[PDB]
Amino acid sequence: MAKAAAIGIDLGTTYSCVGVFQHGKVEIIANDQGNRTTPSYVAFTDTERLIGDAAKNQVALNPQNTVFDAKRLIGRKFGDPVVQSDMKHWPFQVINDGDKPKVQVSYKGETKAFYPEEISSMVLTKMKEIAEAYLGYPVTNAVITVPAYFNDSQRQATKDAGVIAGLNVLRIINEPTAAAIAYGLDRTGKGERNVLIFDLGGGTFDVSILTIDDGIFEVKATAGDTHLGGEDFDNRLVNHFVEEFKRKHKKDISQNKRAVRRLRTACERAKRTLSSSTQASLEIDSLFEGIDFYTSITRARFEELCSDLFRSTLEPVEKALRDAKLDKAQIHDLVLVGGSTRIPKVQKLLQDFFNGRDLNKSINPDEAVAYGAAVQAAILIKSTR
Numbered sequence: 001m002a003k004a005a006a007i008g009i010d011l012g013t014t015y016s017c018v019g020v021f022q023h024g025k026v027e028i029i030a031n032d033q034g035n036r037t038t039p040s041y042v043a044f045t046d047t048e049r050l051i052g053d054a055a056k057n058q059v060a061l062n063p064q065n066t067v068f069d070a071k072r073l074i075g076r077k078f079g080d081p082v083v084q085s086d087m088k089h090w091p092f093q094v095i096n097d098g099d100k101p102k103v104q105v106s107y108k109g110e111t112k113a114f115y116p117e118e119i120s121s122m123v124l125t126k127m128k129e130i131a132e133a134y135l136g137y138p139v140t141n142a143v144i145t146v147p148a149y150f151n152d153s154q155r156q157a158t159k160d161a162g163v164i165a166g167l168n169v170l171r172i173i174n175e176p177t178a179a180a181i182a183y184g185l186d187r188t189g190k191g192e193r194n195v196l197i198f199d200l201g202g203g204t205f206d207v208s209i210l211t212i213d214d215g216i217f218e219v220k221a222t223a224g225d226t227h228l229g230g231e232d233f234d235n236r237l238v239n240h241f242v243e244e245f246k247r248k249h250k251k252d253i254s255q256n257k258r259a260v261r262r263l264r265t266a267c268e269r270a271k272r273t274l275s276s277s278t279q280a281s282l283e284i285d286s287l288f289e290g291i292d293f294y295t296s297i298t299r300a301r302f303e304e305l306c307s308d309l310f311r312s313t314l315e316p317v318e319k320a321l322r323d324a325k326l327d328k329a330q331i332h333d334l335v336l337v338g339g340s341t342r343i344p345k346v347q348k349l350l351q352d353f354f355n356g357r358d359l360n361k362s363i364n365p366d367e368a369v370a371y372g373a374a375v376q377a378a379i380l381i382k383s384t385r
């Protein structure tokens, strides 16, 4: 029953996703708000702890006590220059507990501090409960994914997050490996198969090159930008619309925190529409000083606004190829991961770079990692019996 069942969890930087493999198919499980992915956010309020959508939904009202980006801290020492640099950009407090970072917040009127693995365990507990509501019984066996570049300390702290969350961690597997499994790229028989995974998420960009030799995965190269993602594209749209509001009304809205956040969420929404329509409409009632902001933007203008950022995704692709010592024509498969890979201009730039090649994109790119983890979790629980 429950003991013969296992879930696959993509514990992402900005969003998490859970899947289950049963009756010959992967089911990506929707949360209680009907969303197939859940924000990797934990909010501490005057009455409760919120996880996911409810936590992300009140981030503007409670920024000091809304934790996100715990994955950037997990398995790291406080003195790590990555931690010291990131801390300057977070509205929540990060404290030092014997060279270990803790996020410090106000919860039910009291000061509390949490290890990154405790924050990530709250996200994992939510994914576990989302799976349990779908299945109708508690599932505790899980495969949890991590970036291919995670070291042993980061892998161990992710496993620790799983244990705190009440999950039996069958295995910690690499995100690009789970994506290659999702497309069945490890079941093509014999001979070395070179796979490139292009993973453009909400806040990070990862390029991975893998060689699959008779089911055995080998990481040949990892490249990318840990601070490039979908939210940089939302921010480019925001600057455009702030400048358009200034041209139409001779008013600067950039200082009105509420106006900027309402514009940001509307921009993120319009950006998604631009992946399937050649225009998107913004409909903001009373954006600033009672002025409605009803406008539109073409896909051509959005592509111009992010042109340099889209083009920058090709440097880590070239870098990964040189590190792996492979030319373009030596790559057998190209896999898209992350919601931002739905952007037509991004697909076109990657396909043209690989000389007109087809892209593996039939699986929802923000779901491919959980899909593969779910497949692996099923194989692993079956072998355990």
Ligand SMILES: Nc1ncnc2c1nc(Cl)n2[C@@H]1O[C@H](CO)[C@@H](O)[C@H]1O
Pocket: 015, 200, 201, 202, 203, 229, 230, 231, 268, 271, 272, 273, 275, 338, 339, 340, 341, 342, 343, 366
């Ligand atoms: N249809 C889409 N067109 C463009 N961007 C998209 C799309 N869907 C998602 Cl999710 N994202 C973005 O992916 C990230 C999460 O993986 C977020 O930045 C989200 O906006």
